[PDB]
Design a protein around this ligand. Structure first.
Ligand SMILES: [Mg+2]
Ligand SMILES: [Mg+2]
Ligand SMILES: [Mg+2]
Ligand SMILES: [Mg+2]
Ligand SMILES: [Mg+2]
Ligand SMILES: [Mg+2]
Ligand SMILES: [Mg+2]
Ligand SMILES: [Mg+2]
Ligand SMILES: [Mg+2]
Ligand SMILES: [Mg+2]
Ligand SMILES: [Mg+2]
Ligand SMILES: [Mg+2]
Ligand SMILES: [Mg+2]
Ligand SMILES: [Mg+2]
Ligand SMILES: [Mg+2]
Ligand SMILES: [Mg+2]
Ligand SMILES: [Mg+2]
Ligand SMILES: [Mg+2]
Ligand SMILES: [Mg+2]
Ligand SMILES: [Mg+2]
Ligand SMILES: [Mg+2]
Ligand SMILES: [Mg+2]
Ligand SMILES: [Mg+2]
Ligand SMILES: [Mg+2]
Ligand SMILES: [Mg+2]
Ligand SMILES: [Mg+2]
Ligand SMILES: [Mg+2]
Ligand SMILES: [Mg+2]
Ligand SMILES: [Mg+2]
Ligand SMILES: [Mg+2]
Ligand SMILES: [Mg+2]
Ligand SMILES: [Mg+2]
Ligand SMILES: [Mg+2]
Ligand SMILES: [Mg+2]
Ligand SMILES: [Mg+2]
Ligand SMILES: [Mg+2]
Ligand SMILES: [Mg+2]
Ligand SMILES: [Mg+2]
Ligand SMILES: [Mg+2]
Ligand SMILES: [Mg+2]
Ligand SMILES: [Mg+2]
Ligand SMILES: [Mg+2]
Ligand SMILES: [Mg+2]
Ligand SMILES: [Mg+2]
Ligand SMILES: [Mg+2]
Ligand SMILES: [Mg+2]
Ligand SMILES: [Mg+2]
Ligand SMILES: [Mg+2]
Ligand SMILES: [Mg+2]
Ligand SMILES: [Mg+2]
Ligand SMILES: [Mg+2]
Ligand SMILES: [Mg+2]
Ligand SMILES: [Mg+2]
Ligand SMILES: [Mg+2]
Ligand SMILES: [Mg+2]
Ligand SMILES: [Mg+2]
Ligand SMILES: [Mg+2]
Ligand SMILES: [Mg+2]
Ligand SMILES: [Mg+2]
Ligand SMILES: [Mg+2]
Ligand SMILES: [Mg+2]
Ligand SMILES: [Mg+2]
Ligand SMILES: [Mg+2]
Ligand SMILES: [Mg+2]
Ligand SMILES: [Mg+2]
Ligand SMILES: [Mg+2]
Ligand SMILES: [Mg+2]
Ligand SMILES: [Mg+2]
Ligand SMILES: [Zn+2]
Lengths: 118, 119, 56, 142
RNA sequence: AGUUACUAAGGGCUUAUGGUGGAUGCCUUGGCACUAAUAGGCGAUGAAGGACGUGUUAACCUGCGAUAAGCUUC
RNA sequence: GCGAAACAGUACCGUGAGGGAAAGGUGAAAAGAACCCAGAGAUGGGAGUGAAAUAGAUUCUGAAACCAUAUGCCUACAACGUGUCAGAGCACAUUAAUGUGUGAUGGCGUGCGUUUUGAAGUAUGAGCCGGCGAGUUAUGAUAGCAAGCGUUAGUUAACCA
RNA sequence: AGGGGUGAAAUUCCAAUCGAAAUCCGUGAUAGCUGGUUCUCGUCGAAAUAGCUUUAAGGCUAGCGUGAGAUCACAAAUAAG
RNA sequence: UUCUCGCAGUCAGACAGUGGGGGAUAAGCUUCAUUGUCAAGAGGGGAAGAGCCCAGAUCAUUAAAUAAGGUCCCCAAAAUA
RNA sequence: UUGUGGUAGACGAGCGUUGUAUUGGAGUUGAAGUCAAAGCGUGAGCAUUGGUGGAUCCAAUACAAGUGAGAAUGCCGGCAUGAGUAACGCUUGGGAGUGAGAAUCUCCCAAACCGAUUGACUAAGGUUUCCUGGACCAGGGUCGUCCUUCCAGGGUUAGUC
């Protein structure tokens, strides 16, 4: 019983080739280089999901910090005032407010500024 | 690299000029390469102007250049030059020969040229 | 000396970018009309107004 | 409406033939013939014969005007090669590959001929999607 | 003074097509391993194996042996 | 699969003993393309036969590497394991899906196997693609799991039909 | 004519090969030494130590892993005295 | 982590702190005892680093609080005295 | 509720290929193969449609294996890179002609080398390479209308060698 390989190697090879579509030259043509690039690309994608979670936080912090310095308050004290006033809002939504709703963002800063903590 | 070909020696160049000038004086047209026609033209013009007096000294000078051809010998080419060709150019201030460029050869792409006696 | 790394199919074409050919300038004969490359005797042996060679 | 002519196993190499084919693509009939008749290259007296045969079977077989023909695409595909053994020095040997080219010239009368080719490609894609939708309708029907 | 598109000699990506190439799939006057029987030899009455030749038929293959692509008998 | 599906122990290699290949498939039927056009001709384009000629003797199907053509996007101040996460603009419309093709720009980023305490490696192996290519069989021993038969149990080997 | 020949002797020559030709066979010699060994997922997960070894690039037993079973406290860990 | 049975792999280790031997209170040296990491372990700090510090990655989330480390710009985040 | 980094290694659960046995089913109104697409799965993997293709194939439960290729300076076949790069292995000019096409073929005139030889007769070896006509698949390191290449016909005469 001589089992002969055909359509088994080609199908699993073409899957890797399909994944590595849009690469530079031989990186999409040859199966070997395509397989290496897909594995490396998967590693990159894994690492950059974690790094995206951190980098977008940093960007929101930067935007919020800037929005506060125009009014004379700093980020380091704004978050402290937020905690003492029990207000719980993401820096993402706060930055979205300062870019989309200047009046309501200014309302939040006014309350945290001076109103009695709790 | 050794055992190279003799090459385009000075003696070979003089012999080449001699053969083409003898032929162009015998027949009246030569279909050669352009760079060879542009070198044979000088000797052709020099021979024609020196053969305008027809003295025995001028025959001795020409005989150092003429060679035997099919249509004329080395002695009948002398009669053709001194009695038929040269007397025609008796008051022309030079420029007895014209060189014009034909197309490239099929096997070399070199520029051919026809050298003729300008009437 | 020999290449320690294989040259891709892109560097090859970049080098060949200067290997393109040029169209030789052509003109029209003034007695028969066929195109001949410039400054050269036509196929009829008629250059300008001078009969150079016998007709082809 | 494309008329065409072909030549299998042309002795010229594809590398040395594409250089001449790129001098005639997009050119008018008379100008292409004039350009190719005075170029000092080996692959010029063979593309000329193919071009002339293509004009003949365009204005005789397919019925084209003859004053609107332009060279649509002239290419030299890779042909079958021939292997020979060149004797080297010190007893070694190498393989000489005699290269051949499959020449094909195509001329059209319509200056917008690329659009129809893209249209046919689009029609094939549309028929595939249409088949998928009819199959989906059949699946939901049952 | 300031912010500005068109360039593509050439190249890159996607898709479609053409060409070189014979992988995969289907098949086989071919191989392999055995079963049940038969048989287990040919040769000086010239053996096994070859050379040569033989056509109404180019060569090759096969058959045949000056009775030479076949002869006689049942 | 015999080295040999074909005229294989042939072609070929060696003084010799000896060594030793590759190569199959038109179509139901040659009905194998008369004839016309270009060409010197092969040949090609029509015509004709045929269900099919993109089945045409290069003759079942025709993959990838490889070479060319083109719709769309980007690219000539730019430091690049060539990708990934965000991201304008451009062009389309699908196994209708927070759609697809390209990617100005920003953040991050020194291949795969091997062998080593330790390899991006100035260690090693692979030019690319496709096929082939390395834990088996026979006879016994031990152990795990499961079934049959059981307390004078259990089970046959050769051989015969 | 090859554990042989020839050698005015160099390990010369013996069919482009000679510290002992070429070819076939035993033969699929042996190699504690390199290289290679092909589908997936889940649970757990080491060692580079001791003794012996004509042993030191290897092997055997012990130590460390894993699967099954038993031991419930008198067994084994973490703190205080 | 004790006892019994089946199957192993391992016998080339490296560095950091601490106590020593050899060296010269030299070595990214060599040989031991012990605590850790790497081997077989990514992430953050150290500008870049197998072994140092903080810790232990099941997958997705553009949610929040923190460890070592840090807050003029590169590069997230500070002010007073 | 406690967990889910992982090499050597141990254990468990599955995918896929070929064939056989039982059931059922599809197929010239188009099977396998093969290409493309914007699908489904935790993974091996599995579908749908359209093009090409022309006759076998699929599902379930079991059984038996030449059953899974990325690496062995692995074997075979094809194709790249180097690269249109090195090289093309001692000998000139012209006139006329043939031819579809001529530096290369034929004739003529020169020209240049050999001339104890590139001259002439034969031994050995080669085995038709010899002569005539035709051809330009392949070979000729370019070209070719030409060849020691190919096709057809022909050619070797002993009493004294
Ligand atoms: Mg395989
Ligand atoms: Mg001299
Ligand atoms: Mg390209
Ligand atoms: Mg160039
Ligand atoms: Mg030799
Ligand atoms: Mg090559
Ligand atoms: Mg261009
Ligand atoms: Mg492009
Ligand atoms: Mg022989
Ligand atoms: Mg046809
Ligand atoms: Mg082919
Ligand atoms: Mg075919
Ligand atoms: Mg720019
Ligand atoms: Mg600058
Ligand atoms: Mg830099
Ligand atoms: Mg960058
Ligand atoms: Mg980037
Ligand atoms: Mg980088
Ligand atoms: Mg591997
Ligand atoms: Mg090492
Ligand atoms: Mg080392
Ligand atoms: Mg490097
Ligand atoms: Mg080295
Ligand atoms: Mg090594
Ligand atoms: Mg290498
Ligand atoms: Mg391979
Ligand atoms: Mg048992
Ligand atoms: Mg002995
Ligand atoms: Mg000695
Ligand atoms: Mg010898
Ligand atoms: Mg062996
Ligand atoms: Mg041994
Ligand atoms: Mg664990
Ligand atoms: Mg340890
Ligand atoms: Mg220890
Ligand atoms: Mg050892
Ligand atoms: Mg042990
Ligand atoms: Mg130690
Ligand atoms: Mg030690
Ligand atoms: Mg220490
Ligand atoms: Mg010390
Ligand atoms: Mg010390
Ligand atoms: Mg050390
Ligand atoms: Mg290790
Ligand atoms: Mg780490
Ligand atoms: Mg760091
Ligand atoms: Mg964990
Ligand atoms: Mg905080
Ligand atoms: Mg802190
Ligand atoms: Mg900052
Ligand atoms: Mg695990
Ligand atoms: Mg099956
Ligand atoms: Mg199909
Ligand atoms: Mg196998
Ligand atoms: Mg090569
Ligand atoms: Mg090349
Ligand atoms: Mg170079
Ligand atoms: Mg050069
Ligand atoms: Mg050169
Ligand atoms: Mg020569
Ligand atoms: Mg010469
Ligand atoms: Mg002399
Ligand atoms: Mg002689
Ligand atoms: Mg012969
Ligand atoms: Mg002859
Ligand atoms: Mg002849
Ligand atoms: Mg030739
Ligand atoms: Mg007589
Ligand atoms: Zn003219």
């Amino acid at each position: 019983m001589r089992i002969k390989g055909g359509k088994q190697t080609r199908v699993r090879r073409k899957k890797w080739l399909k994944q590595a579509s849009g690469s530079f030259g031989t990186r999409h043509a040859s199966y070997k280089v395509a397989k290496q690039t897909v594995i490396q690309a998967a590693k990159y994608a894994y690492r950059d999901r974690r790094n995206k979670k951190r980098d977008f936080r940093s960007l929101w912090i930067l935007r919020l910090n800037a929005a506060l310095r125009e009014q004379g308050m700093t980020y380091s004290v704004f978050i402290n005032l937020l905690k003492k006033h029990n207000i719980e809002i993401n820096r993402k939504v706060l930055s979205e407010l300062a870019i989309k709703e200047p009046s309501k963002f200014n309302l939040i800063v006014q309350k945290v500024k001076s109103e009695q903590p709790k | 690299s050794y055992i190279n070909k003799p090459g385009k020696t000075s003696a070979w160049r003089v012999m080449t000029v001699r053969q083409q000038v003898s032929a162009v004086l015998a027949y009246g047209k030569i279909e050669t390469t352009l760079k060879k026609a542009k070198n044979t033209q000088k000797r052709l013009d020099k021979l024609i102007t020196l053969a305008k007096v027809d003295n025995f000294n001028n025959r001795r000078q020409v005989k150092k250049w003429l060679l035997n051809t099919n249509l004329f010998d080395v002695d009948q080419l002398m009669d053709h030059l001194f009695s038929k060709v040269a007397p025609k150019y008796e008051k022309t201030p030079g420029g007895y020969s014209r060189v014009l460029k034909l197309g490239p050869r099929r096997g070399d792409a070199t520029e051919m040229a026809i050298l003729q006696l300008t009437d | 000396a020999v290449q320690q790394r294989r040259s891709s199919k892109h560097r090859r074409d970049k080098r060949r970018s200067h290997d393109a050919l040029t169209a030789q300038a052509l003109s029209v004969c003034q007695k028969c009309g066929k195109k001949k490359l410039f400054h050269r005797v036509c196929s009829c042996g008629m250059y300008g107004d001078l009969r150079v060679k016998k007709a082809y | 409406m494309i008329a065409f002519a072909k030549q299998f196993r042309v002795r010229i190499s594809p590398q040395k033939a594409r250089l001449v084919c790129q001098l005639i693509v997009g050119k008018k009939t008379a100008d292409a013939q004039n350009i190719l008749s005075n170029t000092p290259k080996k692959a010029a007296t063979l593309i000329a014969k193919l071009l002339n045969s293509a004009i003949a079977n365009a204005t005789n077989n397919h019925g084209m005007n003859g004053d609107a023909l332009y060279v649509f695409e002239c290419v030299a595909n890779q042909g079958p090669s021939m292997k020979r053994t060149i004797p080297r020095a010190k007893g070694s040997s190498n393989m000489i590959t005699k290269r051949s080219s499959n020449l094909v010239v195509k001329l059209s009368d319509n200056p917008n001929e690329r659009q129809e080719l893209i249209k046919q490609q689009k029609a094939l894609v549309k028929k595939r999607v249409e088949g998928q939708q009819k199959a989906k309708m059949a699946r939901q029907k049952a």
